[PDB]
UniProtKB/Swiss-Prot annotation:
Listed name of the protein: Fas apoptotic inhibitory molecule 1
Compartments (UniProt record): Cytoplasm
Function text: Plays a role as an inducible effector molecule that mediates Fas resistance produced by surface Ig engagement in B cells.
Family to which this protein belongs: Belongs to the FAIM1 family.
Positions carrying N-acetylthreonine: T2
GO terms under cellular component: cytoplasm
Superkingdom classification of source: Eukaryota
Species in which this protein is naturally found: Homo sapiens
GO biological process: apoptotic process; negative regulation of extrinsic apoptotic signaling pathway via death domain receptors
Keyword terms of this UniProt record: Acetylation, Apoptosis, Cytoplasm
Length: 90
């Protein structure tokens, strides 16, 4: 996972899940892994900002990763599940 930018460790109704996100800032590639399995892949995109939505665990809990621009030509990555959220950036 050479473009890994964020990892979230969450506890849902059905146990703990690991969500990993790769984001390529030259290619625009996005990959979301949940519990080691690819759930979303976008190989190549012009734009970097936006959101991906996907479903986690046996109960298919909705999760959204938002990608927003911040200072210094950087991005922040926010995972939101059930109205709570945790931001990552480097």
């Amino acid at each position: 996972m050479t473009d890994l930018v964020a990892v979230w460790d969450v506890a849902l109704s059905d146990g703990v899940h690991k969500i990993e996100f790769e984001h390529g800032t030259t290619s625009g590639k996005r990959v979301v892994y949940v519990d080691g399995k690819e759930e979303i892949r976008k190989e190549w995109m012009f734009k970097l900002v936006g959101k991906e939505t996907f479903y986690v665990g046996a109960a298919k809990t909705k999760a959204t990763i938002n990608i927003d621009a911040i200072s210094g030509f950087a991005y922040e990555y926010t995972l939101e599940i059930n109205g709570k959220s945790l931001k990552k950036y480097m």
